[PDB]
Design an enzyme around this catalytic site. Structure first.
Site, PDB file in Angstrom:
ATOM      1  N   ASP A   8      21.765 -49.732  21.781  1.00 41.04           N
ATOM      2  CA  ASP A   8      20.937 -48.999  20.838  1.00 41.04           C
ATOM      3  C   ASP A   8      20.144 -50.024  20.009  1.00 41.04           C
ATOM      4  O   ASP A   8      20.527 -51.194  19.933  1.00 41.04           O
ATOM      5  CB  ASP A   8      21.819 -48.146  19.932  1.00 41.04           C
ATOM      6  CG  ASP A   8      21.061 -47.303  18.938  1.00 41.04           C
ATOM      7  OD1 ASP A   8      20.084 -46.637  19.378  1.00 41.04           O
ATOM      8  OD2 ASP A   8      21.456 -47.328  17.738  1.00 41.04           O
ATOM      9  N   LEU A   9      19.033 -49.585  19.384  1.00 42.53           N
ATOM     10  CA  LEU A   9      18.257 -50.492  18.523  1.00 42.53           C
ATOM     11  C   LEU A   9      18.543 -50.195  17.045  1.00 42.53           C
ATOM     12  O   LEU A   9      19.068 -51.053  16.319  1.00 42.53           O
ATOM     13  CB  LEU A   9      16.767 -50.427  18.856  1.00 42.53           C
ATOM     14  CG  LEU A   9      15.919 -51.585  18.322  1.00 42.53           C
ATOM     15  CD1 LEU A   9      14.577 -51.618  19.011  1.00 42.53           C
ATOM     16  CD2 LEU A   9      15.720 -51.516  16.818  1.00 42.53           C
ATOM     17  N   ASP A  10      18.121 -49.017  16.564  1.00 48.68           N
ATOM     18  CA  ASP A  10      18.141 -48.745  15.139  1.00 48.68           C
ATOM     19  C   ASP A  10      19.583 -48.689  14.620  1.00 48.68           C
ATOM     20  O   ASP A  10      20.390 -47.869  15.069  1.00 48.68           O
ATOM     21  CB  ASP A  10      17.372 -47.460  14.837  1.00 48.68           C
ATOM     22  CG  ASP A  10      15.957 -47.422  15.414  1.00 48.68           C
ATOM     23  OD1 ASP A  10      15.210 -48.410  15.221  1.00 48.68           O
ATOM     24  OD2 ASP A  10      15.577 -46.392  16.010  1.00 48.68           O
ATOM     25  N   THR A  16      16.810 -50.645  10.914  1.00 50.38           N
ATOM     26  CA  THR A  16      15.769 -49.645  10.921  1.00 50.38           C
ATOM     27  C   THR A  16      16.333 -48.227  10.836  1.00 50.38           C
ATOM     28  O   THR A  16      15.558 -47.302  10.559  1.00 50.38           O
ATOM     29  CB  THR A  16      14.869 -49.817  12.139  1.00 50.38           C
ATOM     30  OG1 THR A  16      15.706 -50.117  13.263  1.00 50.38           O
ATOM     31  CG2 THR A  16      13.837 -50.901  11.919  1.00 50.38           C
ATOM     32  N   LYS A  45      21.138 -39.717  12.908  1.00 47.35           N
ATOM     33  CA  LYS A  45      21.104 -40.994  13.601  1.00 47.35           C
ATOM     34  C   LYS A  45      21.207 -40.763  15.112  1.00 47.35           C
ATOM     35  O   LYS A  45      22.024 -39.970  15.580  1.00 47.35           O
ATOM     36  CB  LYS A  45      22.221 -41.923  13.128  1.00 47.35           C
ATOM     37  CG  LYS A  45      22.119 -42.388  11.694  1.00 47.35           C
ATOM     38  CD  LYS A  45      23.230 -43.352  11.298  1.00 47.35           C
ATOM     39  CE  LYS A  45      23.011 -43.901   9.902  1.00 47.35           C
ATOM     40  NZ  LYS A  45      24.169 -44.688   9.435  1.00 47.35           N
ATOM     41  N   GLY A  46      20.357 -41.467  15.865  1.00 48.44           N
ATOM     42  CA  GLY A  46      20.400 -41.417  17.318  1.00 48.44           C
ATOM     43  C   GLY A  46      19.630 -40.255  17.927  1.00 48.44           C
ATOM     44  O   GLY A  46      19.329 -40.281  19.133  1.00 48.44           O
ATOM     45  N   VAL A  47      19.266 -39.237  17.136  1.00 44.94           N
ATOM     46  CA  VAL A  47      18.640 -38.080  17.775  1.00 44.94           C
ATOM     47  C   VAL A  47      17.121 -38.235  17.705  1.00 44.94           C
ATOM     48  O   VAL A  47      16.582 -38.936  16.856  1.00 44.94           O
ATOM     49  CB  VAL A  47      19.137 -36.710  17.280  1.00 44.94           C
ATOM     50  CG1 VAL A  47      20.645 -36.645  17.185  1.00 44.94           C
ATOM     51  CG2 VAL A  47      18.522 -36.295  15.987  1.00 44.94           C
ATOM     52  N   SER A 114      17.577 -47.108  23.385  1.00 46.28           N
ATOM     53  CA  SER A 114      17.109 -46.517  22.144  1.00 46.28           C
ATOM     54  C   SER A 114      16.367 -45.180  22.420  1.00 46.28           C
ATOM     55  O   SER A 114      15.560 -45.057  23.343  1.00 46.28           O
ATOM     56  CB  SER A 114      16.183 -47.517  21.469  1.00 46.28           C
ATOM     57  OG  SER A 114      15.585 -46.972  20.310  1.00 46.28           O
ATOM     58  N   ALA A 115      16.606 -44.165  21.599  1.00 47.26           N
ATOM     59  CA  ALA A 115      15.856 -42.981  21.631  1.00 47.26           C
ATOM     60  C   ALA A 115      14.471 -43.191  21.011  1.00 47.26           C
ATOM     61  O   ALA A 115      13.709 -42.244  21.040  1.00 47.26           O
ATOM     62  CB  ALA A 115      16.589 -41.903  20.859  1.00 47.26           C
ATOM     63  N   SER A 116      14.177 -44.365  20.418  1.00 49.93           N
ATOM     64  CA  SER A 116      12.942 -44.499  19.615  1.00 49.93           C
ATOM     65  C   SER A 116      11.747 -44.907  20.470  1.00 49.93           C
ATOM     66  O   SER A 116      11.781 -45.912  21.178  1.00 49.93           O
ATOM     67  CB  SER A 116      13.140 -45.497  18.503  1.00 49.93           C
ATOM     68  OG  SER A 116      11.925 -45.732  17.801  1.00 49.93           O
ATOM     69  N   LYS A 117      10.647 -44.170  20.320  1.00 50.54           N
ATOM     70  CA  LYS A 117       9.392 -44.531  20.955  1.00 50.54           C
ATOM     71  C   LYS A 117       8.863 -45.859  20.400  1.00 50.54           C
ATOM     72  O   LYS A 117       8.014 -46.491  21.020  1.00 50.54           O
ATOM     73  CB  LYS A 117       8.340 -43.427  20.782  1.00 50.54           C
ATOM     74  CG  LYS A 117       7.821 -43.212  19.357  1.00 50.54           C
ATOM     75  CD  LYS A 117       6.872 -42.017  19.187  1.00 50.54           C
ATOM     76  CE  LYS A 117       7.467 -40.667  19.547  1.00 50.54           C
ATOM     77  NZ  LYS A 117       8.570 -40.259  18.636  1.00 50.54           N
ATOM     78  N   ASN A 118       9.319 -46.247  19.207  1.00 50.79           N
ATOM     79  CA  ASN A 118       8.918 -47.457  18.532  1.00 50.79           C
ATOM     80  C   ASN A 118       9.790 -48.657  18.934  1.00 50.79           C
ATOM     81  O   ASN A 118       9.595 -49.754  18.408  1.00 50.79           O
ATOM     82  CB  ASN A 118       8.925 -47.221  17.019  1.00 50.79           C
ATOM     83  CG  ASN A 118       7.838 -46.253  16.624  1.00 50.79           C
ATOM     84  OD1 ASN A 118       6.661 -46.559  16.791  1.00 50.79           O
ATOM     85  ND2 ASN A 118       8.209 -45.069  16.154  1.00 50.79           N
ATOM     86  N   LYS A 145      19.725 -38.097  23.317  1.00 53.21           N
ATOM     87  CA  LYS A 145      21.089 -38.216  22.723  1.00 53.21           C
ATOM     88  C   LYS A 145      21.383 -36.945  21.933  1.00 53.21           C
ATOM     89  O   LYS A 145      20.508 -36.484  21.204  1.00 53.21           O
ATOM     90  CB  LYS A 145      21.213 -39.453  21.824  1.00 53.21           C
ATOM     91  CG  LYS A 145      20.986 -40.787  22.507  1.00 53.21           C
ATOM     92  CD  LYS A 145      21.037 -41.977  21.558  1.00 53.21           C
ATOM     93  CE  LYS A 145      20.576 -43.228  22.262  1.00 53.21           C
ATOM     94  NZ  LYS A 145      20.586 -44.414  21.373  1.00 53.21           N
ATOM     95  N   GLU A 169      26.506 -48.904  19.661  1.00 52.29           N
ATOM     96  CA  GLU A 169      25.913 -47.779  18.944  1.00 52.29           C
ATOM     97  C   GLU A 169      26.392 -47.756  17.488  1.00 52.29           C
ATOM     98  O   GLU A 169      27.506 -48.160  17.181  1.00 52.29           O
ATOM     99  CB  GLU A 169      26.260 -46.451  19.620  1.00 52.29           C
ATOM    100  CG  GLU A 169      25.138 -45.901  20.476  1.00 52.29           C
ATOM    101  CD  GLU A 169      24.049 -45.234  19.655  1.00 52.29           C
ATOM    102  OE1 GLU A 169      24.267 -45.040  18.433  1.00 52.29           O
ATOM    103  OE2 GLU A 169      23.012 -44.908  20.233  1.00 52.29           O
ATOM    104  N   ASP A 170      25.546 -47.178  16.624  1.00 49.02           N
ATOM    105  CA  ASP A 170      25.854 -46.960  15.206  1.00 49.02           C
ATOM    106  C   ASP A 170      25.949 -45.473  14.852  1.00 49.02           C
ATOM    107  O   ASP A 170      26.103 -45.167  13.675  1.00 49.02           O
ATOM    108  CB  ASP A 170      24.807 -47.599  14.289  1.00 49.02           C
ATOM    109  CG  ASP A 170      23.465 -46.888  14.357  1.00 49.02           C
ATOM    110  OD1 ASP A 170      23.011 -46.622  15.485  1.00 49.02           O
ATOM    111  OD2 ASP A 170      22.865 -46.617  13.284  1.00 49.02           O
TER     112      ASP A 170
HETATM  113  O1  LIG Z   1      10.671 -41.264  16.085  1.00 53.55           O
HETATM  114  P1  LIG Z   1      11.137 -42.346  17.026  1.00 53.55           P
HETATM  115  O2  LIG Z   1      10.672 -43.726  16.653  1.00 53.55           O
HETATM  116  O3  LIG Z   1      10.854 -41.993  18.474  1.00 53.55           O
HETATM  117  O4  LIG Z   1      12.721 -42.467  16.892  1.00 53.55           O
HETATM  118  C1  LIG Z   1      13.592 -41.478  17.476  1.00 53.55           C
HETATM  119  C2  LIG Z   1      15.016 -41.789  17.048  1.00 53.55           C
HETATM  120  O5  LIG Z   1      15.300 -43.147  17.416  1.00 53.55           O
HETATM  121  C3  LIG Z   1      16.683 -43.434  17.210  1.00 53.55           C
HETATM  122  O6  LIG Z   1      16.833 -44.777  17.634  1.00 53.55           O
HETATM  123  C4  LIG Z   1      17.020 -43.315  15.726  1.00 53.55           C
HETATM  124  O7  LIG Z   1      18.428 -43.507  15.582  1.00 53.55           O
HETATM  125  C5  LIG Z   1      16.684 -41.943  15.206  1.00 53.55           C
HETATM  126  O8  LIG Z   1      16.893 -41.959  13.779  1.00 53.55           O
HETATM  127  C6  LIG Z   1      15.244 -41.607  15.551  1.00 53.55           C
HETATM  128  O9  LIG Z   1      14.921 -40.274  15.141  1.00 53.55           O
HETATM  129 MG   LIG Z   2      21.089 -46.211  16.113  1.00 50.49          MG
END
Ligand SMILES: O=P(O)(O)OC[C@H]1O[C@@H](O)[C@H](O)[C@@H](O)[C@@H]1O
Ligand SMILES: [Mg+2]
Ligand code: NA
Length: 219
Positions: A8-10, A16, A45-47, A114-118, A145, A169-170
């Protein structure tokens, strides 16, 4: 011996999760929802972004138009993306850079789950991209997730079975995703948040190859 680590990243690689929290809390308060405190944020977190916003709306039994939902998600993202511009290598959590180096030296694959697009942008900010053998694109999985798909994808992207992988994971949602993937979870955070039934470390300095080894042997 495990053959991959699925990160996982964040909240694992850097702080973050704090910025996602602050951005979601600001968004919620703008629409008159005051219940996004740190305790509630454990459910966020994670979603995914969409599931985060929906959980917030549900908290207040609130309904918005489809147009407004899209605008709100965009507003939070634009804010979050401005928050993270100054992230740098100095923001990598303790132990993480060394772990990445030690994994690579030992020919253990490294994948982002990571679920994050960022996520890719943040790895670039932190000069970590070159350590990763793969990044599982969260837009490419059918289920986010706590579904296991992103961890399965990350393992498959580096040619390793989930059952031969460790996941870091956190979050509650992310631990569940790891469990259901077949990989071995090691959480970072408070037992009061992540459960008493998996290995949990209090901070990322504990994520040494030595310890992942210490842990794996005993599963
Ligand atoms: O909005 P993003 O950048 O795609 O991130 C989606 C999810 O990414 C996960 O890594 C975070 O734990 C969540 O908090 C976040 O909602
Ligand atoms: Mg996380
Ligand atoms: Na960079």
């Amino acid at each position: 011996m495990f053959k991959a680590v699925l990160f996982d990243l964040d909240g694992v690689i850097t702080d973050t999760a704090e910025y996602h929290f602050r951005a979601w809390k600001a968004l919620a308060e703008e629409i008159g929802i005051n219940g996004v405190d740190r305790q509630f944020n454990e459910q966020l977190k994670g979603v995914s972004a969409e599931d985060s916003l929906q959980k917030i709306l549900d908290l207040a039994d609130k309904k918005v138009s489809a147009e407004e939902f899209k605008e709100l998600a965009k507003r939070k993202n634009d804010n979050y993306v401005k928050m993270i511009q100054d992230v740098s290598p100095a923001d990598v959590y303790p132990g993480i850079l060394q772990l990445l180096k030690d994994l690579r030296s030992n020919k253990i694959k490294i994948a982002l789950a990571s679920a994050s697009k960022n996520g890719p942008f943040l790895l670039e900010r932190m000069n970590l991209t070159g350590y990763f053998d793969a990044i599982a694109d969260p837009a490419e999985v059918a289920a986010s997730k706590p579904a296991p798909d992103i961890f399965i994808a990350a393992a498959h992207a580096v040619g390793v079975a989930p059952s031969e992988s460790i996941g870091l994971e956190d979050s509650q949602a992310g631990i569940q995703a790891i469990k259901d993937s077949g990989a071995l979870p090691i959480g970072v955070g408070r037992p009061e948040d992540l459960g008493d039934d998996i290995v949990i470390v209090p901070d990322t300095s504990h994520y040494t190859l030595e310890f992942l080894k210490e842990v794996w042997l005993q599963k």
